[PDB]
Amino acid sequence: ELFTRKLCSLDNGDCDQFCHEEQNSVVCSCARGYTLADNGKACIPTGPYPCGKQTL
Amino acid sequence: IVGGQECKDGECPWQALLINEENEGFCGGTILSEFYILTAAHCLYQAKRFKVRVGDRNTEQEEGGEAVHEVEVVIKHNRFTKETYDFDIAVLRLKTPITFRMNVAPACLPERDWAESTLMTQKTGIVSGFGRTHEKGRQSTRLKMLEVPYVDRNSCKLSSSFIITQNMFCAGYDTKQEDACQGDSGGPHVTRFKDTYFVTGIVSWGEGCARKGKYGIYTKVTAFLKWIDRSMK
Ligand SMILES: O=C(CN1CCC[C@H](NS(=O)(=O)c2ccc3cc(Cl)ccc3c2)C1=O)N1C[C@@H]2C[C@H](C1)c1cccc(=O)n1C2
Ligand SMILES: [Ca+2]
Ligand code: NA
């Protein structure tokens, strides 16, 4: 018997990066160097060379 | 790296290379920040005094965005064990800050729980370095990268003559002749998630290179996330 995928288990809870469930809802956070967007899902780089991006 | 592809311009910006007194590459590292490299503990035993090269893609030419940094502090994990390579991890603090540019940038550190459920459950990660292209060959002069499948711990342990501890994981191919190799030690295992690359492992050891029924063994970075953060304070 396999659980139905919901919350953070469903497409990373629609977060760009870190997803945790708190108070029974999805909460998104970002690595250092990013700030959470107004939609509270996307992470925006705050400077020129943010971590984990290829320099293309 | 045995197999895999050459690292193209800007594709592995977080690669670092440890160089000896003779300016030779002997181990890999990962860029964590302006001041900090991640590598393998056992790499420290390989050279008397060493330095850190970044932005390097071709040992024979001058990359241009290439730079050498000196080590101020070496923080070896106090539990590292020569007999098992458990806790094979160290952090380097540089004397001067790294300049981020084309081919020089840090990898992201994930959070532990999210890393375990999301990153570590992807099909594959990428490993890279300037190590041998064959088990008995010379160091590479070109940076290479190789997509390596995650291996389940069962298959991993069964295939292993030695103890795979909780601080390690397996990645690679049962038969396909691609793997990390001597000289890739200390280098990046990163996992892509939604166009962002996170540090997941440190090149540790293997029984040979790309041998049939064997795998590459990596330090599980998720197990040291807290420590790594302590280190940078
Ligand atoms: O096997 C090893 C270390 N080791 C020995 C020689 C072959 C190989 N060198 S390699 O081919 O250059 C090499 C090095 C790193 C690699 C990383 C990846 Cl991802 C894949 C393949 C790799 C191959 C290697 O890693 N250990 C397992 C146990 C406990 C520790 C660590 C230990 C220490 C000393 C001796 C010994 O026998 N053992 C046995
Ligand atoms: Ca070069
Ligand atoms: Na193999």
Domain ranges for chain A, please list them. Answer: 1-56
A45: chain B residues, CB-CB within 8 Å: none
Which residue from B minimizes the CA distance to A30?
A: B110
Residue B154 belongs to what H/E stretch? helix B153-158
To test the ligand 1 pocket, which listed residue (B81, B133, B146, B205) has its Cβ within 8 A of the most ligand atoms?
Answer: B205
Is B88 marked active-site?
Answer: yes
B138 and B23 housed in the same domain: no
Around B96, how many Cα atoms within 13 Å sit in the side-chain half-sphere? 10
Domain assignment of residue B156, given as a range: 1-12+107-222
Task: Kindly determine whether residue B105 and residue A48, on different chains, have CB atoms separated by under 8 Å.
Answer: no
Closest CA to ligand 1's atom 39: B84
Q: List, in sequence order, the alpha helices (H) in chain A.
A: none
Separation CA A5–CA B220 (nearest Å): 26
CATH topology for the A1-56 domain: Laminin (2.10.25)
Put simply, the answer to whether B100 touches A49 (Cβ < 8 Å) is: yes
Beta strand extents in chain B (DSSP E only) = 5-6, 15-19, 25-33, 36-39, 51-54, 67-76, 90-94, 124-129, 144-149, 168-171, 188-193, 196-206, 216-220
Neighbour count for residue B176 (Cβ, 10 Å): 11
**Secondary structure (H, E, C), B108-146:** ECCCHHHHHHHHCCCCEEEEEECCCCCCCCCCCCECEEE
| SS3 category, B162 | coil
Best A17, A18, A27 residue to mutate vs chain B (most B CBs within 10 Å): A17
Spatial CA neighbour of B95 closest among B119, B128, B72: B72
Q: DSSP class of residue A7? A: G
Q: Which helix (H) or strand (E) holds A26?
A: strand A25-29
Burial B11-42, CB ≥16 within 10 A → b, else e: bbbbbbbbbeeeeebbbbbbbbbebbbbbbbb
Cα A33 from Cα A39, distance rounded (Å):
18
Tell me the nearest-neighbour CA distance from B90 into chain A, angstroms. 20
Q: Residue B103, SS3?
A: coil
Q: What is the stated resolution of the deposited model, in angstroms?
A: 2.4
Using the beta-carbon criterion (under 8 Å), do A56 and B101 form an inter-chain contact? no
Closest CA to B201 of B94, B129, B140: B129
Beta bridge partners of B68: B53
**Sequence letter at residue B63:** E
Q: How many domains does chain B have?
A: 2
**Closest chain B C-alpha to A7 CA, distance in angstroms:** 13
- Do both B98 and B134 map to the same domain? no
- Domain with residue B49: its CATH number is 2.40.10.10
Strand order, beta sheet including B5-6: B5-6, B144-149, B124-129, B188-193, B196-206, B216-220, B168-171
* Judgement on whether residues B78 and B159 belong to the same structural domain of the protein: no
Alpha-carbon Rg of chain B, whole angstroms?
Answer: 16
Count how many residues are written for chain B: 233
